[PDB]
Amino acid sequence: ADWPRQITDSRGTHTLESQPQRIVSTSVTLTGSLLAIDAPVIASGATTPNNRVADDQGFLRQWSKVAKERKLQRLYIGEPSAEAVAAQMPDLILISATGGDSALALYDQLSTIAPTLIINYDDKSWQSLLTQLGEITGHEKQAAERIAQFDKQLAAAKEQIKLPPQPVTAIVYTAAAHSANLWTPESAQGQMLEQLGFTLAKLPAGLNASQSQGKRHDIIQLGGENLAAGLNGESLFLFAGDQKDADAIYANPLLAHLPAVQNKQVYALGTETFRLDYYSAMQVLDRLKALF
Numbered sequence: 648a649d650w651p652r653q654i655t656d657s658r659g660t661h662t663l664e665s666q667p668q669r670i671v672s673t674s675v676t677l678t679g680s681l682l683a684i685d686a687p688v689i690a691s692g693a694t695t696p697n698n699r700v701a702d703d704q705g706f707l708r709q710w711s712k713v714a715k716e717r718k719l720q721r722l723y724i725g726e727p728s729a730e731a732v733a734a735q736m737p738d739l740i741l742i743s744a745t746g747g748d749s750a751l752a753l754y755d756q757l758s759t760i761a762p763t764l765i766i767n768y769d770d771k772s773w774q775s776l777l778t779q780l781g782e783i784t785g786h787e788k789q790a791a792e793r794i795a796q797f798d799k800q801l802a803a804a805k806e807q808i809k810l811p812p813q814p815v816t817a818i819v820y821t822a823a824a825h826s827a828n829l830w831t832p833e834s835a836q837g838q839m840l841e842q843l844g845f846t847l848a849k850l851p852a853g854l855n856a857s858q859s860q861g862k863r864h865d866i867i868q869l870g871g872e873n874l875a876a877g878l879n880g881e882s883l884f885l886f887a888g889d890q891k892d893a894d895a896i897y898a899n900p901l902l903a904h905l906p907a908v909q910n911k912q913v914y915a916l917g918t919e920t921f922r923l924d925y926y927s928a929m930q931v932l933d934r935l936k937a938l939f
Contacts, residue, residue: 648785656764666762669738670784673757674746675700676835677766679922681741684780685789687713690735693722694747698919705919707926724748729756737761741783744769745864773838797925804932805844809939815882816848817916818874822895827874828866830886839923848878875901883907889915914938 653662672678672688679699681688687710698705700722703712714720719735724747740763742750750757750765757763764783768776777794781787820827831837831854832847840847850873858868877883883905885892893913896902907913920931 654764654783657767659758659765661758661762661764663739663762666739671735671737671740671761673740673750673753674743676743676746677741680776680780680835681784682710683707683922683924684777684784684786684793685710686780686784686786687711689714689717689719690732690737691720692724694724696918697921699921707922707924727753729753729760732757733760739764741766747865749864768835768838769833771838773835773842776835776838793925797928800925800928800932801843804928807932807936812844812846813881814846814848814879815884816878817884817886819887820874820895821887822898827869827871829869829874831867836921836923843923850878871901875904877902877905877907880906882912884914884916886916886918886920889917 651662651664653660655661670681670686670688672681672691675692675694675697678688678691685708691714693700703709711720727748738761740757740761742754742757742763742765744765744767754763754765766776766779766783771779777790781790818827818829832840832849833854837847850869853869853873854867856863856867858870885896887895892915896905896908902908914935916931917934920927920934923931
């Protein structure tokens with residue numbers, strides 16, 4: 648709004664008596680989410696070689712240059728400190744439903760430092776998440792702009808693609824780390840795909856980390872049963888890497904019997920295709936259209 652107001656999160660309510668243009672983000676999920684809606688953050692963290700966080704290389708609208716221009720914007724993690732965060736004099740701190748590190752303890756510690764809000768998108772669709780961002784940030788107009796320009800692409804894109812309906816899955820692993828990590832739709836990416844008309848595979852009781860014998864965030868592991876069985880087995884996209892991932896699979900007799908490999912219905916989403924937007928959609932849309 649143009650004046651002070653009150654906002655409500657998942658539960659706790661924070662009054663916005665006055666928050667000067669000083670948007671702050673903890674998780675990288677929001678960082679990109681906020682940026683996409685024309686809402687750059689002065690201070691933020693980083694994760695892995697996502698590319699989105701990188702420099703002018705791998706950017707949609709390109710509003711991040713603003714944060715860096717002010718110097719602010721952390722790009723290193725491993726030992727978070729409350730004092731260090733306070734030294735940044737943050738105003739509005741936004742936290743995602745999940746992150747690389749637990750924020751249960753930081754949540755309250757962050758609030759004391761400055762207005763800390765938490766958004767739960769895991770139990771809500773992507774469209775719903777955006778609505779909250781527009782309401783929380785009051786950037787509804789901007790959303791109508793991106794949504795409109797994007798809505799048109801979705802319509803044509805939805806009709807541009809020609810292929811019967813079927814479930815799909817995605818797996819990522821490194822022959823070096825000798826570890827099998829799978830990505831679940833519970834992430835914002837999964838909701839975004841569902842909005843495209845695609846269906847993500849679901850592993851009951853499996854997602855609940857049946858190997859970890861407990862609960863875990865970030866990502867989910869697997870014994871190796873669903874992997875080889877390419878989950879649904881009706882389609883599988885390679886997000887681990889381009890041709891490198893393919894060869895890796897070939898060297899894996901377990902995933903050799905995967906229908907996707909036999910039919911070669913694998914698409915190299917790449918790490919850049921992390922988020923989908925009118926801008927990036929241009930590369931992803933064409934990349935996923937080269938096959939047809």
